[PDB]
Amino acid sequence: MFVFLSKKIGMPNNAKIEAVCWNKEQGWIAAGGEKGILKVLKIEDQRQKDGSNPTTTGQLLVNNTLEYHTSNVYLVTWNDRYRKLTSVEENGIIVVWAYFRELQLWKEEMINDRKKSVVRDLKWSPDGQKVCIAYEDGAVIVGSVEGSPLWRKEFPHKLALIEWSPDSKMMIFGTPEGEVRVYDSQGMEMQRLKIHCLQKLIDPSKSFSPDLPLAAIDWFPQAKMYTDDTPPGLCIAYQCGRVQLMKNEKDDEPVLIDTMMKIFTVKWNPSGSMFAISGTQDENGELKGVVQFYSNAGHHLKTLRVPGSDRVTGVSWEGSGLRIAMAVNQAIFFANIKPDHKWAYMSDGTLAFAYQKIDRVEYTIIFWDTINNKKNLKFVKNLCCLRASGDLCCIVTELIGYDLWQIDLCNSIGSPIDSKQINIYPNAVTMTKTHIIVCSQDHVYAWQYKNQVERLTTFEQQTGLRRVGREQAWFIDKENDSNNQYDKDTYDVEPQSEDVICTVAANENFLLVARISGTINVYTFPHISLENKLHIQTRPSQMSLNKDATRLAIIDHNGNLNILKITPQGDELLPFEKKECWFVKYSDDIPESFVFMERSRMYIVNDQTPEEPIITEGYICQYKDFQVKIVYLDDIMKSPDGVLRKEELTLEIEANILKDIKDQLYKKSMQEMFIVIKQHDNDCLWRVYAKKALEDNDFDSAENAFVQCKDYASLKFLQRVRELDDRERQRAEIQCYFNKVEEAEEIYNKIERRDLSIQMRMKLGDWAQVVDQIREGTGQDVELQKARLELGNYYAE
């Protein structure tokens, strides 16, 4: 997952912005100002058509100001069920708006205001039918959507924070002194929470009421609260210190997270996967506005720092969770997020996509064929890792209760083959053509599943011992020599090392293991033995290996990119700069050319010479010969009715070399084409040249191209072709030779002489089409009977 910056909305009238609310269904972001400046507006689309917008959008669709106020506003909330928008001021004036179908006109539909009182926090029910209003005095008023007051109770203790349960049946209140109380929907006290987060800061004698004010309490909706086996979903944070995370209101084994930052706002994901905490951090020596992202377990995935040395106030997520809005001083910064989005792409065209369920515990894997448009679905409980090969995919899952991880292989359809179980935590997994290597914090495990040339090492019979298909597992600091076959109970994991590993890379005959301290270890596949020890100043993050094992790309944790030349016991850093890089992929055919993706911009680089950037909002699947394939996974997630088309999601971008080659082919003649193509001498270029030559009814150029390509079958094809009389049978046989038969049938039909088409169809082996053609066509009995017998045999087999 990565985060970066985007368009920056300017100040309305040079006024402080402190409250921003983003709608979830239709995008209507609302921001409050200083002198009663409320502005609701539409935001630009992240992606348009299949390319960059010539107008670049740049149009605020609504951008209308709804002042009505002389004082400041600091509470603006959107009702998701309806069009209502609630906003209050410092004078205790609660104003609710609604949308009328006119020229972007909003008029007040609730004007209430209680004098001699101060509003602290209003809240709306998850169902959108209840509103809770509270004051510093202690009075709590709960109302419906219609206007009939449910109850207006009075509480002795002062209140600071209000929270609603997902089922809207119970209430969470927080006092300014700092404590959490649970009440019923009828204002009846149930109990008081106990806090374990604040250690060494609270009074040792009494812990229920410390002197630390509460920053933010957030309960993630759509989450179960009458169960104990679920990831945590309720978070309570204090003004500066630890944040405490619960799976339930009655839980007594907390999850603790410590951050050195002044917590002010914590917001959950629309899907509940991650949550963001905004505020000011003094670790840099002064005040810096930062937003930190944490997982449901809590791992500090990323930290976003704004360029301004100021405070970040208020965070809102988009409906899909792909963009975030922060109100920083006098501007509304928009941060773009690319999540992990576990996906795998095979060489056969099948794409495997992992989708997380609302249960946050179970996953669905989707196998979509990019050619036949076939869709297959499987349900996998737990997912740790997903990887792909030319024709196989590896799935790494976790079994809870046995502290074990299962790795299994699946074909294009997804049938499991040779599933194995390991007791090693999959910190970083990779898998090459003939091996699968998973690395924990301190252990390394390798498994061979293919034979030396091309076989499956699972169904073998010869001598007793294990020759091919053996599993190895060793330690990183010591035990360089590869060990023998391990077991799920014999092998030991307890020993730990001071230098942990971060990233692993694999090749056909080489293996690279990185270290956090900056050391890279090289291993050989025939017999695992360390050879070299490369040194890097910064810890690598992604890492990528070139074909033939000549160079490699190092991506630092901060996003910096550089090129390292691997040499025996040496270190050569090629100067390439290009900081803040995100994705890097070396070509599997060209030893030099590669593609790197930086801040929604792609670059094709060869011989340290970059080209022009292209705006792209997709992920790179593969870089084949002068071609790069991208797939828009966001559109896949947002499918309306259940049809996926290869012409809308999948896009292919050609290199400048291929574009120029096609350019010069299409305007210039044939001989200079041959002369300029002899230097490159590539299989794809020869293939395209031969296709162009044969399309123009030229055989000398076509036979020359096939001779240069060293293809005997195509030469036999052309030799068979050249003995033809008419000008149309050659076209039909060529076009049915390529991949396609329907146009050949049509050209037979327009040429007539149908028995030729019948013979072509019967030799091609398709019998149903032959039966359909024969029926009511000629009425000859013998070939109809023979075709029906053949079709019956085909169905029986």
Binding site: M190, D229, P231, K247, D252, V361, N382, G401, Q461
Partner: protein, 626 residues
């Protein structure tokens, strides 16, 4: 299904001419389950749940009278000991500290103490004896004592921590709040002994009071005091009541010296043990479930305390019953549930029932559920890819049989040494009597009302049965008993397994032992080629063809089914599919030049490279059709 004793400790120190006795009254159990407590006259005993031994020596002299009740605090840190010395002690507990147990706070009522209870949330103590009831809060360290008109017998706090329920021997049951006010009062005519609160559940999310009266009845009461109207009757007077975690089971003890298990609705499942004396207190072992953990959780643990002075431990293991015919796998989930799973999309379909299911048999687009004294059948809409189950018919007749099968328009039940044929209406149709117990039966396809079947006896003779013939046809004879049988696709051979895990292959045309194998757990025939045999031992599965060396895989699991280019492996209660390569058999068939069988094998979904290979050799060896 099976109940096994684990460890028994007896306390024979009966003391005549002394009010101290050898009886045991209560057995407190820890939430984690690593420690157990018991109370005897003038002593408290500490035990380990897994193995029976005293981790700490018996404590004597702390209380000068008997101990009435012992309870934890749902966190494994406190004990509450109430004695006939008109005093209640609360002790602090922690396994790691050098003093494992030590008294913390002692208080006293005016009269003897009879019952005690704890608060799940706030850890407050409510102790009720004769003429008095007291509440203790750890923070304030100030007890609140109140007088009452007759001796409370039992107390129980709700799982929400808000309500409290108490009962009196005079027939009065009272429900109060944390402030101890008369929220609800109900008057009965019989003494009140056992009460409990139903555990919170996301499906139910409502708490009711379950109280067992001495007039042979069990009653459910709401918060307001209005009865739910169940009033289920019992043969014996209940004594103790305990709910399992998540509110799935109910352990009932009392008269008849039997400890029985029930569903929360009231359906009898099994009886745990019969001691031949009154069981004063029986407790269940709570379980802790991880976030998204996968486990069958068939194991159950119960602890019983009797009147003579025996504290016994029992383990309950649930057997696995399942059915697999084609494209479907219907297995019994946690008791009184049926889950149908498809191997392709891994999707599950759940059917919930109230009584215990005994056998599950699935025919073509038809599933049969055998509830206690009830039979259900569900059909399937074939046109839709997803299945839709509708109850076409229901059978009320009570039938007892360890094996049940359903065929087109008929049912077969195996009981003892007899096989009974039942019509769908319910009336018995035909009977078959054999010498010994019918161990395994296999059903083979055929016309309606004419489906044949194979039967194995404890003697070992294998017989054939036809529906209308009414005369068994002796197929063959085996000296050892028969456990599982299988039939080939063409019905050419038959694989049979004995009690010694011995597999034997018999040819039907000529009765001879062609193949014999040792240490075999399961076996299966192919349904397309008729020749492949896949047999799984405890750790290794072997696939054998005609006159071919076996193929080893070292795959963990047991083989249940074999389909074209597919083997089914079942581990515990989950199932998986694994593909096989037919390249080895194809090569071996090419070795001896039987291209027809090689092509038939390659037709099972082999890679195109082997297809072009086989085509090459077919062209070389002058076989143009193949």
């Amino acid at each position: 299904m099976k109940c096994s004793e684990l460890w028994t400790e007896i306390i024979p120190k009966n003391d005549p001419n002394s009010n101290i006795t050898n009886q045991v009254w209560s057995c407190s159990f820890n939430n984690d389950g690593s420690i157990l407590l018991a109370c005897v006259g003038d002593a408290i005993l500490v035990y380990d749940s897994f193995t029976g031994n005293l981790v700490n020596k018996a404590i004597r002299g702390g209380q000068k009278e008997q101990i009435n009740c012992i309870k934890f605090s749902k966190d494994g840190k406190r004990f509450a000991t109430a004695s006939n010395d008109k005093t209640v002690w609360v002790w602090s507990f922690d396994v790691n500290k050098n003093p494992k147990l030590a008294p913390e706070v002692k208080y006293s009522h005016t009269d003897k103490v009879l019952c005690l209870a704890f608060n799940p949330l706030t850890h407050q103590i409510f102790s009720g004896g004769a003429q008095d009831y007291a509440l203790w809060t750890p923070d304030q360290q100030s007890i609140e004592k109140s007088k009452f008109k007759d001796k409370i017998i039992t107390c129980a706090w709700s799982w929400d921590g808000l309500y409290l329920g108490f009962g009196t021997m005079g027939g009065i049951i009272g429900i109060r709040n944390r402030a101890l006010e008369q929220l609800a009062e109900i008057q009965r005519s019989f003494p009140i002994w056992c009460m409990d609160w139903t555990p919170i559940t996301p499906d139910y999310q409502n708490s009711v009071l379950v109280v067992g009266v001495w007039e042979q009845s069990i009653a459910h009461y709401n918060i307001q005091g209005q009865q739910l109207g169940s009033d289920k009757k019992l043969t014996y007077d209940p004594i103790d009541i305990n709910f399992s975690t998540q509110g799935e089971f109910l352990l009932v003890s009392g008269t008849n010296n039997k400890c029985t298990l029930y569903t929360r609705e009231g359906g009898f499942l099994i009886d745990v043990a019969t001691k031949n004396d009154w069981v004063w207190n029986n407790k269940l072992k709570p379980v802790i479930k991880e976030a998204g953990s996968v486990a069958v959780q068939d194991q159950l643990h119960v602890a019983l305390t009797t009147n003579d002075g025996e504290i016994s431990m029992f383990k309950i293991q649930q057997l696995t019953v399942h059915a697999l015919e084609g494209d479907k796998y219907a297995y019994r989930d946690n008791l009184t549930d049926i889950v149908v799973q498809s191997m392709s999309s891994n999707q599950r379909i759940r059917l919930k029932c109230k009584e215990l299911v005994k056998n599950i048999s699935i025919y073509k687009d038809k599933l049969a559920a055998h509830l206690t004294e009830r039979i259900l059948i569900y059909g399937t809409s074939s046109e839709d890819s997803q299945m839709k189950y509708k109850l076409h018919k229901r059978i009320v007749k009570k039938v007892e049989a360890h094996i049940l099968e359903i065929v087109s328009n008929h049912l077969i039940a195996c009981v003892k040494n007899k096989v009974q044929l039942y019509q769908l209406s319910g009336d018995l149709e035909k009977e078959w009597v054999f010498d010994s117990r019918v161990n395994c039966i296999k059903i083979i396809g055929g016309m309606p009302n004419k489906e044949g079947a194979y039967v194995g006896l404890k003697n070992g003779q294998i017989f054939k049965i036809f529906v209308d013939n009414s005369f068994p046809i002796p197929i063959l004879n085996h000296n050892i008993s028969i456990k599982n049988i299988d039939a080939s696709q063409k019905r050419k051979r038959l694989a049979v397994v004995d009690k010694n895990s011995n597999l034997t292959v018999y040819d039907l045309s000529n009765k001879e032992q062609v193949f014999q194998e040792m240490n075999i757990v399961s076996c299966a025939f192919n349904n397309n080629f008729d020749d492949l045999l896949a047999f799984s031992s405890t750790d290794t599965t072997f696939i054998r063809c005609s006159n071919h060396p076996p193929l080893s895989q070292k795959i963990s699991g047991q083989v249940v089914g074999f389909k074209a280019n597919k083997l089914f492996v079942l581990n515990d209660n989950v199932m998986s599919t694994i593909d096989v390569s037919m390249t080895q058999t194809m090569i071996k068939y090419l070795e001896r030049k039987e291209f027809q069988s090689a092509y038939e094998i390659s037709l099972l979904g082999v890679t195109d490279q082997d297809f072009l290979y086989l085509g090459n050799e077919a062209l070389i060896a002058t076989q143009f059709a193949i």
